[PDB]
């Protein structure tokens, strides 16, 4: 009858679509960390609209019975590069810290499911299953990752691509895509809230900090903001409820990473000014780092400028 | 009194691993005979780093 | 990602062959012939879409 009140394994199958790759050329390839181009976990609730991420906000646990990551080229055979991929089952064993490029690749053809292939053909990177009965939780990665993520797909580039005339290409280039056929088994019916649905965004605004003041007159120091989520896309706007006498000028600039939209300023003489907006995504540890440019003469500041953060609750974000 | 085995036994191992990625010179960098070797990599078991051997 | 989640989809570069199958229902509905002039779920059993990624 109905109202079962029972827990049962439900095995499912399908195929999906990960993100397209983006091979690096020459003007974006000078370090070990450029050889690594996609760091992408292989959990369930880690995508948008794939039939495995949307289908996992309705159970609570999972276990990849057998998975495989399938590469498909989008290039002619007349182009030349070479890339390898491996799935590490210890998501906090990070290759972020290796410096010499050769060591970075030798620790990839050691994991027990690694492959190697040109970017003009196809091959399946399989996932390898621990010898236990462990069940991993769905949802966003909250405190520790060894509960949630069952693997991490690291694809990384060996060579540098090049045209038919041998001239190494300078810009980026799309070299195919990744699809992930899967078979997994879920256990506990419920709903995780972290991938909320559209028509429920709220635009929270209740976090009001304050910029630290300088000590000297001219300075371009920096500042960091903690307590934010490990990953999101925020926006800042200024906020000012103070007074002044002479100038009290200041000009904060965007954080020192990729995302940047504009600038922001503060200026409190008769030609007063308070405007700007910066967009960014917080680093994986859950903070950010700004840089300031202060050029006022008063030293007894005693009035730290206030700011604001706001975000849209629409999904994992 | 503790002690352990005075036995020197050979153990044999098999496998493969990764060594280097070789780069090739062109015309500007190919001037002398020293810029014509492009990798020298010893073969001792302890020379690599990150290979399980 | 709604074009590959379908259970009988294939992906390929357009310089080689493939076979995209038709995945039959579990029930035994028979579909009518002729031009539709109606709702379409009587007179069709599938639709072949081809995309460009």
């Amino acid at each position: 009858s109905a109202r079962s009140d029972v827990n049962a394994i439900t095995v499912l199958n399908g195929s999906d679509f990960l993100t397209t790759v983006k091979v690096r050329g020459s003007n974006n390839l000078t370090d070990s960390k450029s050889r690594i181009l996609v760091k992408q976990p292989i959990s369930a609730s880690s995508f948008l609209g794939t039939r495995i991420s949307g289908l996992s906000q309705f159970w609570e646990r999972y276990r990849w019975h057998k998975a495989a990551v399938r590469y498909v080229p989008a290039v002619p055979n007349t182009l030349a590069c070479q890339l390898i991929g491996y799935i590490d089952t210890d998501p906090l064993d990070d290759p972020n810290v290796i410096l010499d490029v050769d060591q970075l690749l030798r620790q990839a053809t050691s994991q027990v499911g690694a492959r190697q292939w040109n970017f003009s053909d196809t091959t399946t990177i399989p996932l390898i299953v621990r010898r236990d009965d462990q069940l991993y939780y769905t949802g966003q990665d909250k405190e520790n990752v060894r509960f949630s993520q069952q693997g991490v797909f690291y694809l990384l580039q060996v060579t540098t691509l090049l045209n038919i005339s041998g001239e190494a290409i300078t810009n980026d280039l799309i070299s195919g895509s990744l699809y992930l056929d899967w078979v997994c088994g879920f256990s506990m019916p419920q709903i995780n809230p972290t991938p909320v649905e559209i028509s429920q965004l709220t635009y929270n605004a209740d976090t009001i900090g304050n910029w630290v003041p300088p000590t000297e007159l001219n300075q371009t120091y920096t500042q960091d903001i903690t307590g934010l989520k490990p990953n999101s896309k925020f926006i800042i706007v200024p906020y000012m409820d103070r007074t002044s006498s002479e100038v009290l000028q200041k000009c904060t600039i965007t954080c020192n990473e990729v995302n940047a939209v504009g600038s922001i300023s503060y200026f409190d003489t008769n030609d007063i000014k308070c405007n700007g907006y910066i967009t960014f995504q917080a680093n994986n540890i859950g903070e950010a780092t700004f840089t300031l440019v202060t050029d006022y003469k008063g030293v007894t500041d005693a009035k730290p400028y206030q700011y604001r953060i706001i975000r849209a609750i629409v999904g994992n974000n | 009194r503790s002690a352990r085995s005075d036995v020197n036994a050979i153990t044999v191992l098999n496998g493969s691993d990764f060594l280097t990625t070789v780069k090739v010179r062109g015309s500007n960098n190919l001037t002398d005979s020293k810029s014509r070797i492009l990798v020298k990599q010893p073969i001792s078991a302890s020379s690599f780093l990150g290979t399980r051997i | 990602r709604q074009a590959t989640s379908q259970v009988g989809a294939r992906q390929w570069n357009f310089s080689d062959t493939t076979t995209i199958p038709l995945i039959v229902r579990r029930d035994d509905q028979l579909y009518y012939t002729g031009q539709d002039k109606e709702n379409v779920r009587f007179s069709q059993q599938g639709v072949f879409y081809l995309l460009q990624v």
Binding site: - | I10, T11, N14, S16, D17, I53 | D16
Partner: peptide, 23 residues
């Protein structure tokens, strides 16, 4: 003698890539 098997093997399989199939 005293030899663990299959420590870190690798297997390679070649293929080809013609210019046209001409089915």
């Amino acid at each position: 003698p005293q030899t663990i098997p299959n420590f870190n093997p690798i297997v390679a399989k070649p293929t080809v890539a013609p210019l046209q199939t001409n089915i």
